[PDB]
UniProtKB/Swiss-Prot annotation, chain A:
Tissue expression pattern: Expressed predominantly in cerebral cortex, hippocampus, cerebellum, adrenal medulla and retina with weak expression detected in non-neuronal tissues.
Organism: Rattus norvegicus (Rat)
Designated name of the protein: Syntaxin-1A
Full-length numbering of the shown residues: 191 to 256 of 288
Task performed by this protein: Plays an essential role in hormone and neurotransmitter calcium-dependent exocytosis and endocytosis. Part of the SNARE (Soluble NSF Attachment Receptor) complex composed of SNAP25, STX1A and VAMP2 which mediates the fusion of synaptic vesicles with the presynaptic plasma membrane. STX1A and SNAP25 are localized on the plasma membrane while VAMP2 resides in synaptic vesicles. The pairing of the three SNAREs from the N-terminal SNARE motifs to the C-terminal anchors leads to the formation of the SNARE complex, which brings membranes into close proximity and results in final fusion.
Single Gene Ontology BP annotation: positive regulation of catecholamine secretion
UniProtKB/Swiss-Prot annotation, chains C, D, E, F:
Residues found modified as Phosphoserine: S19, S22, S188
Coiled-coil blocks: none
One annotated Gene Ontology cellular component of this protein: terminal bouton
UniProt protein name: Alpha-soluble NSF attachment protein
Subunit structure, as described in the record: Interacts with PRKCABP, and disrupts the interaction between GRIA2 and PRKCABP, leading to the internalization of GRIA2. Found in a complex with VAMP8. Component of a SNARE-like complex that contains at least ZW10, USE1L, RINT1, STX18 and NAPA/SNAP-alpha. Interacts with VTI1A. Interacts with STX12. Interacts with GNA12 (via N-terminus); the interaction promotes CDH5 localization to plasma membrane.
Organism annotation: Rattus norvegicus
UniProtKB/Swiss-Prot annotation, chain G:
Lineage: Eukaryota, Metazoa, Chordata, Craniata, Vertebrata
This protein's record includes keyword Zinc: no
Side Cytoplasmic, residues: 1-61
Covered range of the whole protein: 29 to 89 of 116
GO cellular component: clathrin-coated vesicle; cytoplasm; cytoplasmic vesicle; cytoplasmic vesicle membrane; glutamatergic synapse; membrane; neuron projection terminus; perinuclear region of cytoplasm
Family to which this protein belongs: Belongs to the synaptobrevin family.
Name of the featured protein: Vesicle-associated membrane protein 2
Residues at the site labelled (Microbial infection) Cleavage: Q30, K31, L32, R38, A39, Q48, F49, A53, A54
Source organism per UniProt: Rattus norvegicus
Gene that encodes it: Vamp2
PTM remark: Phosphorylated by PRKCZ in vitro and this phosphorylation is increased in the presence of WDFY2.
Any Gene Ontology biological process: response to glucose
Amino acid sequence: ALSEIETRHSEIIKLENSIRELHDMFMDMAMLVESQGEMIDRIEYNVEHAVDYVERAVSDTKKAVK
Amino acid sequence: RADQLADESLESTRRMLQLVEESKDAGIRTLVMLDEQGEQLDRVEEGMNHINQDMKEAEKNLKDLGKARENEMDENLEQVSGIIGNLRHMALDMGNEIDTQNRQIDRIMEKADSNKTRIDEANQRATKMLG
Amino acid sequence: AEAMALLAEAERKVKNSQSFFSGLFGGSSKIEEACEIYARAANMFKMAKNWSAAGNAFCQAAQLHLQLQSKHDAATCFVDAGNAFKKADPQEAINCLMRAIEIYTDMGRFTIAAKHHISIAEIYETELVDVEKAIAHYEQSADYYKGEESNSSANKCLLKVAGYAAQLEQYQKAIDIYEQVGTSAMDSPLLKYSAKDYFFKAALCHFCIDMLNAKLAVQKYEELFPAFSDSRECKLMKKLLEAHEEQNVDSYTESVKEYDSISRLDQWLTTMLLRIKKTIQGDEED
Amino acid sequence: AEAMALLAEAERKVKNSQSFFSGLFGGSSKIEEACEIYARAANMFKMAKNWSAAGNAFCQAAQLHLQLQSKHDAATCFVDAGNAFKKADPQEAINCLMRAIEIYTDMGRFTIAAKHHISIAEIYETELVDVEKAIAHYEQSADYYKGEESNSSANKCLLKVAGYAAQLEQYQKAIDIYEQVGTSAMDSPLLKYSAKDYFFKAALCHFCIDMLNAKLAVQKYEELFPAFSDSRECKLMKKLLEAHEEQNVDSYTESVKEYDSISRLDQWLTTMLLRIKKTIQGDEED
Amino acid sequence: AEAMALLAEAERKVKNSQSFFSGLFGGSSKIEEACEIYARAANMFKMAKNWSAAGNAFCQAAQLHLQLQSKHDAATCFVDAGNAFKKADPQEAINCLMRAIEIYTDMGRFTIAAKHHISIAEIYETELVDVEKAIAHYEQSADYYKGEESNSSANKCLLKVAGYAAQLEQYQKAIDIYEQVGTSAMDSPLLKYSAKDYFFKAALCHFCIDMLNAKLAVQKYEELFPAFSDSRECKLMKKLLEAHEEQNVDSYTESVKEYDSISRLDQWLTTMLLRIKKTIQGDEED
Amino acid sequence: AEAMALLAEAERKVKNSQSFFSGLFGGSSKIEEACEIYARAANMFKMAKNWSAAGNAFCQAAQLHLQLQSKHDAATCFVDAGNAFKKADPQEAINCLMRAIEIYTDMGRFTIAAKHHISIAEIYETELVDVEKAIAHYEQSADYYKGEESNSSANKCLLKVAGYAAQLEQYQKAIDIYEQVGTSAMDSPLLKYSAKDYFFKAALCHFCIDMLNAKLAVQKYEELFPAFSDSRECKLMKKLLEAHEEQNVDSYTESVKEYDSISRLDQWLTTMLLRIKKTIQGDEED
Amino acid sequence: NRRLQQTQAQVDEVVDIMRVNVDKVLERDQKLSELDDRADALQAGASQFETSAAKLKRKYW
């Protein structure tokens, strides 16, 4: 009976639908997580060293009061 | 078109199995990357608590200084459904690894601007009593 | 080692100098010492898992820290106090946070003011049940995020506002919020998907209207029938609109019974769907 | 605590001293004192949400800061001013940012210069509606990102450049940008995924090219039957290329209607697709 | 250049001055210099991959750094030493870390204290196999994370505690942990999915139960086949409860054979399933 | 504002003072001047798109800085120089980086050292095409990552090492690397899924062994049957192992053609599978 | 229709978590960028602090 085989169909496509769109979000995600990764590399970097320069600044201030 | 709909929609579920498989692997990178990001921040805070101290001392030192078709079909979909187990292993952990860090990042930005100010004041009070 | 000992010493030193004690200078150098004391006490109170004492102690250390001029680290102390009372058994978790925001606020640090502002409304709702003030907070906070142009965060807050606004019967004021957060979400194609639920919510909220609004909102909605995401938005709404306009608490509660199969309903939806289900019966068995 | 009062005090102290008021040494602490004043005013202005009064206030404080010897925190103030004007009712947001970048740039701070540069081009488009200059900025900024070996941001910007370039008839310059952003994308197996859409966009863009500029760029693509991600990129393209080489505005309009079933068509694609639809019809009755 | 030389000189300078050399202020600049020395040695040792020497050297520089009165930067060194010994040849990996936490803890930095606390229990388990002490750490650490309202990490620890609690026969104490970590997981619609596995584990963990404690836990679980995720949770559980109540050590063993098809069984599950498989056999002879 | 002028003044000042110029003190305070000079010039050089000049300029400021005793700000500059030469037209983009690591390494900053170490081996391969030195760097770098318990980056690098090692005919050393990276990946359930491909590679890699080194490696693999993931690993391998132990290069070339469906064969695989497709034929015509 | 409706929403439920992922991951991107403008602006003053702390060294040491 087509009324039964046709019903199955409409349900599978509408299933395929919601699918591909969701998967789209997975892709964009990996694309977003990446951009953020390279941006944090510069953050930590500038911060890490920022602590190195200050570490030398404080070491001098301490020896500037003795 | 029975067989033309039970196969095309199935042909997609097959092109769908890999999809979530491809997104799962792509998601794994988010796992290893958000894990690396969490580590590289543990040291940031370390350097943030490092500056917090030194400044407090410096400031004080300056004061002291101033003064079987469906059987397989299902298996292909089951794999897509099982992947949720991996999709769960991601969104969760990192999803929470997000809060902990963000709440920490703000505490990092503040002190970051805090020390900045105390440096401008220290410099001003220092200039008036320079060589 | 002993908290009581420190709290006491701290007290003896936390007091504006006078007489031969003041001499020429006196203030900051002392009050700070006491701050460090109370902090050291609140610490052991926290390891001992007494929290309450730890929190009240942080309140002391913080207050004193303000008596020295250094508002920043102080406010952060209030945050520590808040985390204490929060994970503790007494209240005050609300006061410490208000005392933190007043500072981040008049200081000029609105970004964080809103960061803790949403935490505040989040406690004032889940605990104090004070929804009116919670909403006032979610709102003012969203205004700050919007100020920083941090759209996303501002939307998170707005979503909170509207979401709880519909629960407090404020349906119209909700649909409007959904409208605004909708026109400010299509500018970014990274929210395309998201733009749906908004229209579904805004169309579900009813200020006891006698027809459209919703029939007009579903119309304003731009869908592409061969769509996939959108299947979880207007398509249902239409059926609901028809089930509403036509007093039939059998075609509405049924369509929601079917929809609850392809898209599980959350507490929110259910609450409102039932409210509508009641408006229908209350127009029917009347 | 009155802004007007502060603004007046600030002006009263912002002036190079001489004669009796000078004494011997000038006083950068004065100009800076005035800066703190204006800042304090701009803050309460942003409080009451007068923005137009906050922004112009920051400008003052900012300008004065330069008269001191602190370009850094000054530029940051210019940013505060830009953020104000942005979320305000007047303009100036463009001037403040240009005044900010001149500083970050001459200071040796390109990372940040580009961070605000993209914001700029984003304003000159979403607001002033001046894409011809916006693209210019999206580009120079992508160049700065490309200098900091920050492939990511560089590509985001390039994508903006080409994206709006196609909308400004610049179809060829668009494919070129897509080619570059495509070549410097395969190197990293992290972009392999999205690397499809680039080829689809590029092949779609046509500088009125009367040939197979795309049919040559469609085969250049490395598609794979089993690769299902690919079925969402060139597979359609080929079918479109045949529908153009035969002036059949029916096979193309049908293939796009079918493709809108397996892969939704975003606003962009739609616009360009109709542009090609016209190149076809137009070549029929032309 | 030579580490031996540095280690020696570091010893020469690591001593309170005296006579003219001391003058008026010997200061801690010397003890600190020695610290920089030993660190410089531990460094080349870590390069040569001698680790042992590197670690012990860091311990030296660290201890001296304590003689300097700068706990923070010291503790971090203790961590360096820990990272050394850990991925080294000798032991001490446990010692350094304990000496690190005593500092982060007394200092008031529980956030980082828990960070190394979990690393500790992780080594005390994957190496020393001192489960009873590891659980104590995973737990206390989870308490700290819970205090920092960092639900995340707190749960990451609790899961460890319960997970390794079932291995120590502590089945009831395990299910309870799963109950708590579940209750403080429903309040957040961001844990809806995982909430399954918890109920599966808790329902599996049986403290020699006889009633329907699991049938009751599975009932507490709101399942609706349409909320499909659940399939990988209780659907099996019920079948297991049936094969258990029917003392059929064939249906249970068949069910574990089938479920291992729809959802693979990790180490944990396996071991426990066999324990239940024995409770059935031992009941068959009852 | 002229770079050409600054480069001159910098030179005129970079020189160990003496006589009157030295007065009483001097040295670092003079060399530092020339340092910021060259940096100031390098900036405008990078502004005029003269990169080459900018890079050589940074090289000057850098070397001089070393002549002041501040390896830190120096190495960072060397990196800036590398960033210039890289996105420039000359070379030395490899020299600057080496000169940077020699500093980050001897200084003790292995974390960041490996951070640039991988960038180095990445350029020495995508540019210089010096796989020999490339592998050496990818490796040593992974060793550093392994020291900082950064299992993650460590394996990323190992994967590079083995990956390109199989290309240099180093099949055996490759499988060994895959074994190591495999034993240090199962401890982390966050990698179990990917752990398959490792065994697939290690089994595909053949150091001209005619035995069943692979039939033994495929057995060492832990697979059940209903594994959604495992379908992309050994299942094929066995079919390949049989097509070899029967000198039937027709079932192997067919299996690679079929498997190429459920899982697209990337470059690597193609090359090795061809090196396996040849051995069989060569075993036939022999 | 059995397995169909079964696998139907099985993903419609996975379509939600990503809606949360894409957002929670984008909210971070902007926050980190905010720290990039402050953290650097901080060390920017550190360049002054070092020199300033040195000038104090030649006056009291």
